[PDB]
Design an enzyme around this catalytic site. Structure first.
Site, PDB file in Angstrom:
ATOM      1  N   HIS A 113      34.440  40.190  41.702  1.00 39.68           N
ATOM      2  CA  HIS A 113      34.165  41.426  40.995  1.00 39.68           C
ATOM      3  C   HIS A 113      32.930  42.110  41.491  1.00 39.68           C
ATOM      4  O   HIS A 113      32.993  43.269  41.837  1.00 39.68           O
ATOM      5  CB  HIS A 113      34.064  41.168  39.505  1.00 39.68           C
ATOM      6  CG  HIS A 113      33.921  42.437  38.680  1.00 39.68           C
ATOM      7  ND1 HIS A 113      35.002  43.112  38.157  1.00 39.68           N
ATOM      8  CD2 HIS A 113      32.779  43.140  38.265  1.00 39.68           C
ATOM      9  CE1 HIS A 113      34.567  44.163  37.453  1.00 39.68           C
ATOM     10  NE2 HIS A 113      33.206  44.183  37.503  1.00 39.68           N
ATOM     11  N   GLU A 114      31.814  41.374  41.580  1.00 39.38           N
ATOM     12  CA  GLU A 114      30.517  41.893  41.984  1.00 39.38           C
ATOM     13  C   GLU A 114      30.507  42.371  43.425  1.00 39.38           C
ATOM     14  O   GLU A 114      29.870  43.406  43.750  1.00 39.38           O
ATOM     15  CB  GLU A 114      29.453  40.821  41.855  1.00 39.38           C
ATOM     16  CG  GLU A 114      29.129  40.457  40.412  1.00 39.38           C
ATOM     17  CD  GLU A 114      28.994  41.689  39.534  1.00 39.38           C
ATOM     18  OE1 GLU A 114      29.800  41.809  38.580  1.00 39.38           O
ATOM     19  OE2 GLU A 114      28.087  42.521  39.831  1.00 39.38           O
ATOM     20  N   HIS A 117      31.800  45.725  43.657  1.00 40.71           N
ATOM     21  CA  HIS A 117      30.756  46.710  43.471  1.00 40.71           C
ATOM     22  C   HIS A 117      29.904  46.797  44.715  1.00 40.71           C
ATOM     23  O   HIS A 117      29.710  47.896  45.196  1.00 40.71           O
ATOM     24  CB  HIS A 117      29.881  46.403  42.231  1.00 40.71           C
ATOM     25  CG  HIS A 117      30.595  46.617  40.907  1.00 40.71           C
ATOM     26  ND1 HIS A 117      31.266  47.757  40.604  1.00 40.71           N
ATOM     27  CD2 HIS A 117      30.701  45.804  39.805  1.00 40.71           C
ATOM     28  CE1 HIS A 117      31.785  47.648  39.385  1.00 40.71           C
ATOM     29  NE2 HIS A 117      31.423  46.460  38.887  1.00 40.71           N
ATOM     30  N   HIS A 123      34.786  50.646  38.539  1.00 39.58           N
ATOM     31  CA  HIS A 123      35.723  49.887  37.736  1.00 39.58           C
ATOM     32  C   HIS A 123      37.077  50.535  37.743  1.00 39.58           C
ATOM     33  O   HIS A 123      37.197  51.760  37.993  1.00 39.58           O
ATOM     34  CB  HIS A 123      35.233  49.767  36.275  1.00 39.58           C
ATOM     35  CG  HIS A 123      34.081  48.796  36.067  1.00 39.58           C
ATOM     36  ND1 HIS A 123      33.044  49.056  35.208  1.00 39.58           N
ATOM     37  CD2 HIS A 123      33.835  47.547  36.611  1.00 39.58           C
ATOM     38  CE1 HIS A 123      32.175  48.041  35.230  1.00 39.58           C
ATOM     39  NE2 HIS A 123      32.652  47.109  36.096  1.00 39.58           N
TER      40      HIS A 123
END
Ligand code: KLJ
Ligand code: CA
Ligand code: CA
Ligand code: CA
Ligand code: ZN
Ligand code: ZN
Length: 158
Positions: A113-114, A117, A123
């Site tokens: 997930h990170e 980013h 998102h």
């Protein structure tokens, strides 16, 4: 938003969470990166010394930016988009309990997930997507990126 403008990207684990075995943190982070290199032109390298594009950091409370952590639960981790200095850096809340499995917070799924980013993805609203904003544990042998995720990163790279 910002993308990285180069194919060879570095990361560096800055410090290790007490919650896991060393080799297990190495492996979670390496596996998380591979998930993004599998669908992009980019190549990732772990360097043990000096400046890296993406610094992987375990921290708690106020830890030097403006995205202070909030004890256990809540904010699991955060990361900054591509750019120099803190750009690309991913910070993991040490007030969480990091694991290889499902007790506590799975490091592997959080790091995927990170890094999303770190590479320039915001998102998704699609619950199926790794970039959906809520953490949910799935056997990491069965984890796959949603078509949404793939469509986003390939909009950015390659
Ligand atoms: C589908 O897998 C995951 C989805 C979301 C999260 C992090 C949720 S969070 O930390 O509570 N929200 C802050 C944030 O968005 N920082 O990046 C981890 C894994
Ligand atoms: Ca927290
Ligand atoms: Ca950086
Ligand atoms: Ca911890
Ligand atoms: Zn931070
Ligand atoms: Zn997020």
């Amino acid at each position: 938003g910002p993308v990285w403008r180069k194919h060879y990207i570095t990361y560096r684990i800055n410090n290790y969470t007490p919650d896991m075995n060393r080799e297990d943190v190495d492996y979670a982070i390496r596996k998380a990166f591979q998930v993004w290199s599998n669908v992009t032109p980019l190549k990732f390298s772990k360097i043990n010394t000096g400046m890296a594009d993406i610094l992987v950091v375990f921290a708690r409370g106020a830890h030097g930016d403006d995205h202070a952590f909030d004890g256990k639960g809540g904010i699991l981790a955060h990361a900054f988009g591509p750019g120099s200095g803190i750009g690309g850096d991913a910070h993991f809340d040490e007030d969480e309990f990091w694991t290889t499995h499902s007790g506590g917070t799975n490091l592997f799924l959080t790091a995927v997930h990170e890094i999303g980013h770190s590479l320039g993805l915001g998102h998704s609203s699609d619950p199926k997507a790794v970039m959906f904003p809520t953490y949910k544990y799935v056997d990491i042998n069965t984890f796959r990126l949603s078509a949404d995720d793939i469509r986003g990163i390939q909009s950015l790279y390659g």
